[PDB]
Ligand SMILES: OC[C@H]1O[C@@H](n2cnc3c(N4CCN(c5ccccc5)CC4)ncnc32)[C@H](O)[C@@H]1O
Ligand SMILES: OC[C@H]1O[C@@H](n2cnc3c(N4CCN(c5ccccc5)CC4)ncnc32)[C@H](O)[C@@H]1O
Ligand code: NA
């Protein structure tokens with residue numbers, strides 16, 4: 001049972017047929033506008049639920065959340081512990097993506113700031129101790145309070161400060177990482193974390209059980225504290241549609257694999273499949289789970305043996 | 316009776332507390348998100364109606380327009396000739412403004428593209444010949460067709476291409492300008508128009524009856540074909556809140572002044588007041604009309620004589 005903390009949002013996603021390069025008073029004429037379910041925690045919970053995992057969504061939203069709640073419950077997500085603001089609306093992410101997948105976005109937190117009033121102890125009282133708590137991008141104070149509570153209650157946690165790493169200080173980042181079962185970042189964020197914390201590579205690896213570093217088109221690295229390193233290439237895409245939520249999808253597939261007993265490489269192969277399915281769609285939760293297509297693309301990228309091992313835990 | 320053609324939209328307006336200067340994968344954490352009535356033609360019709368003028372809004376919107384319609388009708392705007400799409404949603408403008416009033420925006424046209432199917436002859440059949448047709452930013456094909464129809468039917472028109480000037484070719488711009496009773500642009504746009512058309516200053520002035528060139532904080536120039544030039548400074552602001560729609564407001568106030576019989580300078584003084592009221596609010600139609608406050612600020616900027624002459628034609 002995975003508890004996913006982080007943002008819950010509505011994503012307003014637009015497509016610019018040009019290149020931001022070519023273009024202060026910027027104006028982009030866009031040819032697509034769609035409104036979809038979002039937030040890092042909603043995205044990850046959705047994917048874990050669709051894949052058959054046991055998952056609870058823990059974050060703050062507005063009263064407008066009813067339909068999103070029904071959507072997620074239909075996919076097996078426990079939404080009992082979503083804090084509903086008395087006054088604020090669910091966060092909104094507004095993003096324009098150009099033909100090269102570059103992005104210009106604005107994020108309005110809304111009810112997300114109230115996540116600092118959530119107590120993981122209440123979740124535990126309701127459903128028991130989760131096997132893993134994901135600490136995703138969120139209200140910063142909530143990110144700290146949740147990490148501290150995980151340590152105090154003895155809950156394994158994944159440090160997943162993607163989008164907030166630029167806003168956090170070195171000390172704040174250090175406080176999010178120590179003792180993590182997993183640290184997730186992309187490659188740029190990893191260099192940034194090292195610069196801001198003042199930690200060396202070895203300093204970090206001595207405080208976590210596993211580093212997971214995504215590399216965009218180059219795939220993903222899984223690095224253990226003893227240096228053992230697994231590199232998994234991407235599942236090659238047939239389209240680049242919209243990059244929003246691809247990292248969330250990787251994490252959800254990887255952690256669902258781990259929850260089902262798969263090893264590190266197989267779990268990262270599953271995560272790579274979910275990631276490409278999101279890259280090939282516009283919303284973050286608009287992809288469909290087709291068991292046969294999953295088995296096929298996993299086999300084409302990684303071999304029939306790996307594919308069979310993975311889908312065996314998804315049927 | 317003024318017919319206002321151009322865009323009809325919903326504006327989603329956000330505030331970035333920083334400076335865009337300081338920041339491809341841009342992400343702005345914003346501290347305000349509001350949804351307001353917009354579109355250049357809606358903005359200008361709203362202001363003309365609030366000021367007591369006779370005005371008809373002529374553009375394309377979606378079925379979602381009902382509430383907007385009621386809003387405008389309550390302020391005297393004839394919305395009978397708004398084309399309602401069978402399938403498309405009203406256009407959306409999404410904009411983030413930083414602390415120095417710089418802007419990053421995306422525009423989704425939606426139903427705006429259907430404005431090319433509007434015939435001004437049908438408007439004329441319903442309400443008679445308008446005294447002036449404003450040709451505001453719109454579906455480009457509609458801008459051309461409307462201008463051509465004004466010439467054919469003998470309707471005075473104002474060339475007001477603003478936001479579309481970068482996307483139109485020199486030839487397309489030339490076709491919008493010849494024979495205009497008024498040409499409206501800002502100063503940057505005037506330089507751009509001269510460059511793209513290949514016309515000199517004198518070439519343009521021989522084809523229009525009046526040039527109106529807004530200068531931002533430096534006010535506005537009104538230039539007749541014989542060179543006679545009136546410069547009107549701004550009504551000084553007490554805040555810079557959001558620059559969206561300020562130009563639309565200037566044009567509406569100016570043209571309402573002209574429709575009420577005021578001279579060029581007095582009309583531009585009125586336009587400058589409406590402009591500052593929009594600069595001091597967030598939406599484009601969120602300002603309120605306070606007769607006494609209007610008279611006071613006009614007198615402080617331009618003297619009691621001018622103020623009294625202007626408010627004499629208002630309520
Ligand atoms: O993973 C994709 C999902 O991320 C969701 N999202 C997009 N921005 C998000 C965010 N912010 C961005 C703005 N900000 C910042 C900080 C430092 C420098 C610059 C900006 C604070 C952190 N925080 C949480 N979720 C976010 C979206 O809803 C989508 O579904
Ligand atoms: O005056 C303020 C009002 O302008 C409304 N608006 C904002 N963009 C608008 C627009 N576009 C922008 C995008 N595009 C372009 C063209 C050249 C270079 C780059 C992009 C086509 C022209 N066209 C009509 N109305 C617009 C808004 O709804 C607000 O209420
Ligand atoms: Na996507």
Ligand code: NA
Pocket residue numbers: 556557558559560561593594595596597598599
């Ligand atoms: Na404004």
